[PDB]
Amino acid sequence: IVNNATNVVIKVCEFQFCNDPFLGVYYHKNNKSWMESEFRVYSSANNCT
């Protein structure tokens, strides 16, 4: 279950998970905006219904 700042996603797949999975939000100084930029959770996704 991940909330990637735009839509709630529920997936049950054979993920090859990273040892340090995370999400990365980048703050842009010039326009003072925060954007979702990094999605480091799974290296692969297969075999799921």
Ligand SMILES: *[C@@H]1O[C@H](CO)[C@@H](O[C@@H]2O[C@H](CO)[C@@H](O)[C@H](O)[C@H]2NC(C)=O)[C@H](O)[C@H]1NC(C)=O
């Ligand atoms: C959050 O995750 C969802 C699902 O993984 C993303 O929605 C998909 O985005 C891709 C990229 O354009 C589309 O091809 C798919 O059709 C989308 N699925 C839908 C609409 O059901 C969503 O883009 C992700 N959000 C961010 C900011 O990365």
Ligand SMILES: *[C@@H]1O[C@H](CO)[C@@H](O[C@@H]2O[C@H](CO)[C@@H](O)[C@H](O)[C@H]2NC(C)=O)[C@H](O)[C@H]1NC(C)=O
């Ligand atoms: C995961 O995906 C693999 C890749 O297709 C599947 O491996 C084969 O699946 C077929 C379909 O039943 C079997 O006949 C083969 O014996 C499987 N192994 C090989 C080496 O071909 C695997 O079944 C999938 N697992 C799940 C739970 O969906």
Ligand SMILES: *[C@@H]1O[C@H](CO)[C@@H](O)[C@H](O)[C@H]1NC(C)=O
């Ligand atoms: C802020 O600037 C960056 C880079 O110029 C851009 O990617 C981002 O979309 C901008 N944010 C807004 C809210 O316009």
